[PDB]
UniProtKB/Swiss-Prot annotation, chains A, B:
It comes from the Bacteria. Disruption phenotype: No expression of OmpC or OmpF during growth at 0% sucrose, low expression of OmpF at 15% sucrose. Single deletion of envZ has no OmpC or OmpF at 0% sucrose, low levels of OmpC and very low levels of OmpF at 15% sucrose. Deletion of both ompR and envZ leads to loss of both OmpC and OmpF expression at 0% and 15% sucrose. ATP binds at H65. Homodimer. Interacts with MzrA. The chain holds residues 229 to 288 of 450 of the full protein. The gene is envZ. This is Sensor histidine kinase EnvZ. Induction: Part of the ompR-envZ operon. It is found in: Cell inner membrane. Residues 51-110 are annotated as: Cytoplasmic dimerization domain (CDD), when dimerized forms osmosensitive core. Member of the two-component regulatory system EnvZ/OmpR involved in osmoregulation (particularly of genes ompF and ompC) as well as other genes. EnvZ functions as a membrane-associated protein kinase that phosphorylates OmpR in response to environmental signals; at low osmolarity OmpR activates ompF transcription, while at high osmolarity it represses ompF and activates ompC transcription. Also dephosphorylates OmpR in the presence of ATP.
Amino acid sequence: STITRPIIELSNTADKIAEGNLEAEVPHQNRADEIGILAKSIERLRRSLKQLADDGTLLMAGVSHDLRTPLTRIRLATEMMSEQDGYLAESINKDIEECNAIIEQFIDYL
Amino acid sequence: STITRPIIELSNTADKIAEGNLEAEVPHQNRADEIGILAKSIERLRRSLKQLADDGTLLMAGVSHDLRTPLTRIRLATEMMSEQDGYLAESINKDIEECNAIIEQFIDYL
């Protein structure tokens, strides 16, 4: 009833987005009827998918960036440790380096 | 029209999913007509969202489980520090807790 064609267009676009084309334009958002309402909802889904994707790609960089602060302060604390505790300072620093290697290496596992 | 009700129902479902209810049930998937085609498309979007959430969650679980080891080693080391270095043991333990909290925060986004 010229509801069929716009509905199939909207469904086709939804399929393409679900399959990975997160920048595809969702049609019919400016329809005045209920298909416009549905199209806006599909655009919300697209925006959520694109957010989760963009976040997944930045996840390791984010984790590394945020952990750097307390890890650096742990290193600072080791630098301040006494001679008696020298062996513990070295052990802890090796643990920090291990955290660094785990983080940097992580992406390699793939 | 005779398909207005299900169109709006599907839009409400899509909104709920986009807002983060990734387990929502998508109605009308087994229909042969326009409604069924749309419903299947919306289910595909839901599945893709859930998969990206699962992917991010898996990666953070991996980061948590790798970092647990060196962070535990640091914790054990602080227990061996001298009394004179107590202030540093306290600082380091606080910073391990910060590491744990950062990881928790990233687990939480998903």
